[PDB]
Design a binder for these strands. Sequence first.
DNA 1: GCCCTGCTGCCGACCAAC
DNA 2: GTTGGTCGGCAGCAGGGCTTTTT
Length: 674
Amino acid sequence: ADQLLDGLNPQQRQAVVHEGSPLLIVAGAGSGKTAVLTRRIAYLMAARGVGVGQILAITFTNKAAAEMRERVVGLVGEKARYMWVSTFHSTCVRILRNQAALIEGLNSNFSIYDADDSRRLLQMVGRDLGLDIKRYSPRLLANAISNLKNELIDPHQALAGLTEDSDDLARAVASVYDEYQRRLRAANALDFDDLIGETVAVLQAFPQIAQYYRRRFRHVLVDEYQDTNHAQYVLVRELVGRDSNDGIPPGELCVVGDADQSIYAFRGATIRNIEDFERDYPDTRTILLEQNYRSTQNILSAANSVIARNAGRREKRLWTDAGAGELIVGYVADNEHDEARFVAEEIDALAEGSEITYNDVAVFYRTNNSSRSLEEVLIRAGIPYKVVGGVRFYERKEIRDIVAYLRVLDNPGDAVSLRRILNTPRRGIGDRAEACVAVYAENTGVGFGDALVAAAQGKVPMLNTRAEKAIAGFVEMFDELRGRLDDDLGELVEAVLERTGYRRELEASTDPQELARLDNLNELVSVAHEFSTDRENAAALGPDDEDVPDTGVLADFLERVSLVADADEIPEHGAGVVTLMTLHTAKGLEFPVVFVTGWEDGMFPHMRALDNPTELSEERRLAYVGITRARQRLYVSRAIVRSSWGQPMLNPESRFLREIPQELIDWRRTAPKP
DNA sequence: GCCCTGCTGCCGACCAAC
DNA sequence: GTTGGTCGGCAGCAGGGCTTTTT
């Protein structure tokens, strides 16, 4: 354990395993590993008898956590897996299950809004107040609402901003924020910003949770601190600065990243955070590290060119020992489809012999010409194609529907699924899920919310006093709710499938897109039971796996059944299939060898950022991060002609390219005739 | 090039009162 | 006996309508 603790750079030292001394990396390479990885972090975290209730890390989406798990189990052999790096929400929920209803009346079963719920939020904000679907863009309305939640401010301030701070922009943002805050109070819905705000509130107001979070978490893992929001920095300063004995500097420090890698400001990332870190963290030990031991000298030259080429870049110089290999080879093409053809042909000629087969080599694009091009040339090549956030996945329904039924199983507070179908002209159509959903008490003298909500043919005279619009509502979920409130999960789901006949409404009925839904709910039942292969979720994959059940608290079961988002299985060595994925799915993922089809002046410089100056700097730093997160062999290409849906747009080789020396941005070594 | 998507909508018992 | 409005579904039907990115 103590035989591999010196030799090279501090880069992966203050990233992986075992040493002392405080931490603030001014990012260099992160390449050298031999004893490097072995020599800072677990020892830093455990230096003061610091355990899981005393350790916390930062993840927005836990893909970065999974990647560091992989790195540690590979080059270290296990340490990270049992150690507490999952998310804020892990500890937040595990202690809010005990002390959540004590703050703002938000019971320990506080609900959480989601991405499809976010889209329906945009729609209902546009169509709820005196607004339209696009007058004030509800997308940016919710974005500013989240920004306000991070800043932890009431809508009243920006409402009074009329003639004080603004005239209609901030006033309207505060208006929609007030409407959504009333909705939150009526619904007890939370999100990441709401969770961190509740955590801060239960620190300040509630004593023992303060002594737990603020003082126990004197050791915290921080990676890529650039995106740390002000609420996030306030929380982390609470956990570290507000030690058990105040007046001393913040607890033992573990913060890494690169501040001028701000690429997600339009996602919500803060810009500098360095001097913001330093004054509330007097223990700030900046480590100006510039060595390198596995990345190449060509990557070094590109990094040192872009470290000063980017004006909004804290010029942290870097030096590399390894030779100048893998000049960044591009490929200029006069068509995106032809570009993808050439790139896939070269990939087939170079890799699919015995190595690099199916997963990692990917192209991140924002003009969807690469979408059709790459998949089409992969199928033409005969190799499969992988798409994670490409095309044909937004205007296609039934995924919102399946997650809607899952949420209804979790919480029957879904009414847009009922709004989808409309029962009676001007009586139970577009009104019975818009008016009475508010007041199931006095909309029309409603005695029971589901009373007149029953087909008059198959009527229930016992309860037909008054209901939604005193006519209708298509009783579809009340039977499921009363079934759920009565039986155990297995017979519940089976009864929803067959007794209520809804999965029989999917299987037997065929006129709508129903059989696909039958398959989807068969998959749902498989998920609720043991169906995954060679991998088990803790001691109980499905919610009913009582072979050795753990954590009878409903929180862990609910999260492990409700966080089914995406997956990937074919291993790293099998990277040949060009994955068609967006930058917002790979926010924390790196790949060894990549072809980038179409790096050109107008696309990777964001079309939005083509005219947006702050986002122009954001995407310049995005080019920076995409370049610097590679390891040995990163390559690009150019596609001059890009035919978008509206009108085709064209670019030459990008300004970010020519910023790097043209020899460094090659286009002739690893892109020859295939 | 579907596409949300409310409007049409047209039967089908309500429901009692006639 | 005696029946027509009005309480009730899931689906046709056109009807303008649409960046890329949309935390």
